[PDB]
Design a binder for these strands. Structure first.
Lengths: 54, 138, 136, 224, 386
RNA sequence: GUGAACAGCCUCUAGUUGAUAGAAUAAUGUAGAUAAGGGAAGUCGGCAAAAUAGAUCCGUAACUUCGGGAUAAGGAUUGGC
RNA sequence: GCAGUCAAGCGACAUUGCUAUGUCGGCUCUUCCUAUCAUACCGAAGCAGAAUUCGGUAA
RNA sequence: GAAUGUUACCGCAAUAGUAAUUGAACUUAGUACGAGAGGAACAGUUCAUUCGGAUAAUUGGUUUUUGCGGCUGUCUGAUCA
RNA sequence: UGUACAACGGGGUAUUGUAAGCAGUAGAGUAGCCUGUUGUUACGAUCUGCUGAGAUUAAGCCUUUGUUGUCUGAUUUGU
């Protein structure tokens, strides 16, 4: 994919880089208590109902 | 969640109910209750048992094929979960259930039609063949 | 849990106590296994060690190629044949209890596994799942 | 070539599946495994936290390419819905009612050619061919019935387990129309298919993979 | 003699003596810390067990291998109709432990509690509160004096409440009096809040809530005279042992020359008050809300009550609390619900329990349908229909 | 009558209703049974239980004093019209 | 142990070569002791990590 | 279970007993340590072993519900029962 | 002397499995009369339709807009 070629390699150590949600996991509880929301990741025509329950 | 149809009776099997059997053929058989599981373990044929839906479908006691039943299928191809589609399906399921109930009632009425004539003939036969009983009655 | 397990073990009914015979499910040439002990079981008074689906046990081959007889090696149970509680909410049981032979590292002796393989065993043992052509 | 690990399992292929347009990873454990793919893939292609039949071996229970994805019968409707939502319309998702639910091990395929367990019925073979749009052949690697576990394939190349014979290697290379190399992964592990996941531009393997193994993987897959 | 083997003693020695409880109501021993920084609130509630049922919950427990999976589990249903305050007790600390200072009753009491004070109620003249009611009125002073005395010397305030038995399907018709310690604001605030609630009713959602952890205290099932084998789990003798085999054979040594109290003799089993803690509430129900057994993942307008009603119990028809696991005591038994009693901070307590589907199939047998509509749709029209 | 049988059970002729009893079904016992997976891992020891049991047909080894083993062993059937 | 060795006291420590004639056992049970096998907490050991030895309270 | 002026309800607690127990899994982290081999703490999180208290939600087990059906001998003239 | 209680009865929920009887151009086949070659009338285990029919339903299931019946039998207790 052309997106991969355009994408820049991950910076080994730099605050100005992709979040790498592992960091998000660490900053809000850690690996033992963090609750990953499977929602908000998929694509829908309208994001307003992205959290709705089937 | 998923309600499974009993292999021996096709009845809805809710989660946490009944027993499931897995054979070396790498397929699963689900039984709603211990009765069906025991019947299957005896190698019985559901088509020969009157109390299972298989016999009724084969015997024609109930409508075996109908247009309403085509809506329910194993959707191997998923849907993108559109909110409007959810409500449309919610209404359509109720409408289809009502229509299927009406059609089943019509089929039952068509199957049971003519019993009145047979009952009347039986009553006539009983009355004609019992003159002494009627004479004593009045 | 012994080496090779990649997670906690579910609490399931005990199917195979010590001395139980379980059929083989790999192309290693063995046909039946005799369980002598169960790894990870806490021995208690009068209580015969018992295994279950996904458990690792030490067994000696009783039937099959003679080269594998009289030697004890770790074995993993792939079928229990006793009803156990699945978290999905179904009391499922297998036709016949069976197991496979593997080294303590979890590597499967046989290149492939035959017949159904329990979910609670394939999930816990990556090698079993990789060498198993059928799950559930 | 990048080194990563599951919670503590070095068999990356078991707990993950990688393709040219999407990737699948297990939800159990933590996000350390998930973040490893992000470092190399970023957000160019979707990465979905998905389970199959409640197991973490989704990498071996499912098989597919950039054009489609296949799941076994044990997959619940919730998992299918999540996979459909989390992937673009260009990636097909088709439930498979085949007797052998181990799609990842039974089926080894790339964007152009596929290999399946001979026991698979012709109906499922045709379904795989249509959904994935690839040539499907019934073949085994030197008697290894599970092609999906003992072989790895991609548009750049493929890798098979060391026991493959020279004649078998030549036949498989001719059939798949890609270079093939017989070797080990994860420090001598013979299960190459389950040990690592590879695509046209990224190979991910366990930490145990030695430097010669990484060099061989890079050379055969032309990643550098 | 070390007997060559070590084995754990059969049965816990703390739950002795194994005698029958003095009352069907399991009196609560200890109340929470009673921190006076929070608003006044009740510490416990009274309910009646109404059988059990199954629940499928989308477990969101992080770290666990069931994270984001669907797990089926058992939940107990307790009938918890609103409770009405009928008095207050002022307790004054003493060197010999807490002592009851005085008790103040409400202006009027329903026949349910008046019945609790008689055993031949139908023969009784029903003189429950003929003079106390007369003393309450015509001066508004006698009670006020007791209230002031309680405010002056009381340390912990307990509210007298009783269940609305007439609302439950039970044919008992008798209410159960109980003392519930008042937590929250100062004792003056406690009595002021209790005073304003005289003759009024208190709901259950104001005490407990979803995801809350509670402790179950109730009398266990009675079983009568039981052998040691089942009473303590003693292993059976091999076969046909002389003078019986289902009993402990050796009772003690020659020295001492007496039977040790801990040798687990046979005797009464069950009917002993027991306390269980860390029970998570899964759902709080209301009798005025239709579709109590419905869920966001079900959409079915059905009540939690199983088809044909519960076994040995009527229809809920009132507010109820759904709790996972098993609660001591049998159906239609008075059970008191108590707070966790400690500042629980485990992830299980913090977990949010959003039910996916609630089982309402008949408990009278191998139920296959959740509501009569499903049964009619499946079986279809019958002979009796026409 | 069933059944090879005076084996086991019911019935006709004939003879009996005599064994202190009313209420409940606590533990433990006496007599008889059932049980998911293992199938002796229990015990001094297969102690007790269990398993095959009649009839028709195929077949029946070592040994042997040729008379026996033998119903060896192991297999197929049993109803009604 | 045998036969020596020197010597603070009135012979301590150190020191020289070799060197079944009985019936009790087992299944269940309760309790007690520490002279601590495992678990809690610590000190010394070539404890770089890992693993391991001894020692102190603790049944 | 008598005596506590009677009955009933709600309470305090002198006193006696007392329980939880142990290993694993993620993160820490292939990080400190280490020439290499290999390889950890703490904190946070998730299960299981033994034991103890409950309870039939689901599943297993029992049938005198002798509840519902079928089978054999025999008897009520036959059917039904 | 009233959302009072008890025996029935009506429903809900369950268990089992298709009841007696009727009719059949189903029914391997065997017989009178006749005269075929689907003859007819007889026997005929079973099967088919009334008939998911019939039976039980609490002795420790839920409910009851109905029917019937019951509601002053003895003793004891005092600061």
């Amino acid at each position: 994919p052309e997106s991969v070629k355009n994408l820049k390699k991950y910076d080994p150590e730099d605050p100005n880089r992709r979040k790498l949600a592992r960091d998000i996991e660490a900053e809000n509880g850690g690996a033992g208590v963090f609750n990953v929301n499977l929602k908000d990741k998929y694509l829908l025509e309208d994001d307003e109902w992205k959290n709705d329950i089937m | 969640m998923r309600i499974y149809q009993c292999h021996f009776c096709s009845s809805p099997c809710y989660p946490g109910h009944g027993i499931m059997f897995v054979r070396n053929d790498a397929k699963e058989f689900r039984f709603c209750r211990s009765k069906c599981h025991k019947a299957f373990k005896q190698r019985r044929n559901p088509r020969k048992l009157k109390w299972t839906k298989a016999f009724r479908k084969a015997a024609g006691k109930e409508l075996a094929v109908d247009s309403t039943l085509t809506f329910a299928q194993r959707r191997n191809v998923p849907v993108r979960y559109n909110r409007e589609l959810v409500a449309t399906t919610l209404k359509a399921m109720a409408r289809i259930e009502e229509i299927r109930q009406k059609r089943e009632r019509a089929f039952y009425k068509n199957r049971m039609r003519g019993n009145k004539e047979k009952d009347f003939l039986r009553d006539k036969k009983l009355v004609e063949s019992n003159p002494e009983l009627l004479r004593i009655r009045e | 849990s012994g080496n090779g397990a990649q997670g906690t073990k579910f609490r399931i009914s005990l199917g195979l106590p010590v001395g139980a015979i379980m059929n083989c499910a790999d192309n290693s040439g063995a046909r039946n296994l005799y369980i002598i002990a169960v790894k990870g079981s806490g021995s208690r008074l009068n209580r015969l060690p018992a295994a279950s689906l996904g458990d690792m046990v030490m067994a000696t081959v009783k039937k099959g190629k003679p080269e594998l007889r009289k030697k004890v090696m770790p074995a993993i149970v792939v079928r229990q044949a006793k009803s156990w509680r699945r978290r999905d909410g179904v009391f499922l049981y297998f036709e016949d209890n069976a197991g496979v032979i593997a080294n303590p590292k979890g590597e499967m002796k046989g290149s492939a596994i035959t017949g159904p393989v329990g979910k609670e065993c394939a999930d816990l043992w990556p090698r079993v799942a990789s060498n198993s052509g059928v799950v559930v | 070539a990048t080194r990563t690990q599951f919670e503590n399992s070095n068999e990356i292929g078991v707990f993950s599946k990688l393709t040219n347009t999407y990737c699948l990873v297990a939800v159990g454990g933590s996000e350390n495994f998930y973040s490893a793919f992000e470092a190399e893939l970023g957000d160019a292609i979707p990465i979905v936290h998905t389970t199959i039949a409640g197991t973490r071996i989704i990498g071996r229970m499912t098989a597919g390419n950039r054009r489609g994805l296949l799941v076994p019968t044990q997959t619940t409707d919730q998992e299918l819905q999540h996979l459909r939502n989390s992937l673009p319309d260009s990636v097909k998702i088709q439930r498979v009612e085949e007797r052998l639910s181990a799609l990842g091990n039974v089926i080894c395929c790339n964007d152009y050619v596929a290999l399946v367990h001979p026991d698979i019925d012709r109906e499922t073979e045709e379904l795989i061919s249509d959904v994935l749009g690839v040539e499907v052949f019934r073949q085994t690697i030197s008697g290894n019935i599970l092609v999906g576990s003992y072989c790895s394939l991609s548009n750049q190349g493929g890798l098979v387990h060391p026991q493959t014979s020279v004649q078998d290697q030549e036949e498989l290379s001719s059939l798949l129309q890609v270079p093939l190399v017989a070797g080990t992964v994860n420090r001598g592990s013979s299960v190459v298919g389950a040990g690592m996941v590879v695509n046209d531009y990224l190979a991910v393997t366990g930490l145990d993979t030695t430097a010669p193994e990484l060099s061989v993987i890079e050379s055969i897959f032309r990643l550098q | 003699s070390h007997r060559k083997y070590e084995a754990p003693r059969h049965g816990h020695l703390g739950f002795l003596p194994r005698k029958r409880a003095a009352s069907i109501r399991a009196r609560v021993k200890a109340f929470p810390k009673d921190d006076r920084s929070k608003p006044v609130a009740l510490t416990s509630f009274l309910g009646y067990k109404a059988g059990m049922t199954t629940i499928v919950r989308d477990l969101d427990r992080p770290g666990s291998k069931f994270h984001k999976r669907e797990v089926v589990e058992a939940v107990t249903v307790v009938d918890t109709p609103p409770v009405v305050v009928v008095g207050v007790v002022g307790y004054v600390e003493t060197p010999r432990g807490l002592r009851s200072l005085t008790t103040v009753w409400a202006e009027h009491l329903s026949d349910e509690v008046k019945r609790r004070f008689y055993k031949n109620w139908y023969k009784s003249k029903k003189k429950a509160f003929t003079k106390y009611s007369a003393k309450y009125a015509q001066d508004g002073a006698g009670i006020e004096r007791e209230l002031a005395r309680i405010k002056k010397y009381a340390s912990v305030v307990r509210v007298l409440v009783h269940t609305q038995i007439r609302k439950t399907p039970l044919a008992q018709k008798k209410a159960h009096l109980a003392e519930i310690q008042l937590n929250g604001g100062s004792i003056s605030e406690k009595v002021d809040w209790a005073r304003e609630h005289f003759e009024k009713t208190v709901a259950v959602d104001s005490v407990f809530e979803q995801n809350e952890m509670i402790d179950a205290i109730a009398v266990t099932k009675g079983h009568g005279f039981e052998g040691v084998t089942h009473r303590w789990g003693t292993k059976k003798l091999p076969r046909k042992t002389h003078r019986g085999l289902r009993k402990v054979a050796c009772i003690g040594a020659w020295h001492p020359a007496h039977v040790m109290w801990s040798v687990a003799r046979a005797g009464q089993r069950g009917y002993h008050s027991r306390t269980s803690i860390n029970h998570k509430i899964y759902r709080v129900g209301k009798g005025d809300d239709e579709a109590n057994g419905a869920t966001s993942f079900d959409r079915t307008k059905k009540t939690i009550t199983p088809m044909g009603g519960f076994v040995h119990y009527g229809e809920i028809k009132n507010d109820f609390i759904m709790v996972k696991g098993c609660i001591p005591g049998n159906r239609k038994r008075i059970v008191t619900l108590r707070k966790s009693l400690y500042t629980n901070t485990s992830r299980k307590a913090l977990e949010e329990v959003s039910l996916k589907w609630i089982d309402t199939a008949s408990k009278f047998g191998k139920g296959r349908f959740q509501t009569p509509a499903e049964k009619h749709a499946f079986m279809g029209t019958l002979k009796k229909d026409l």
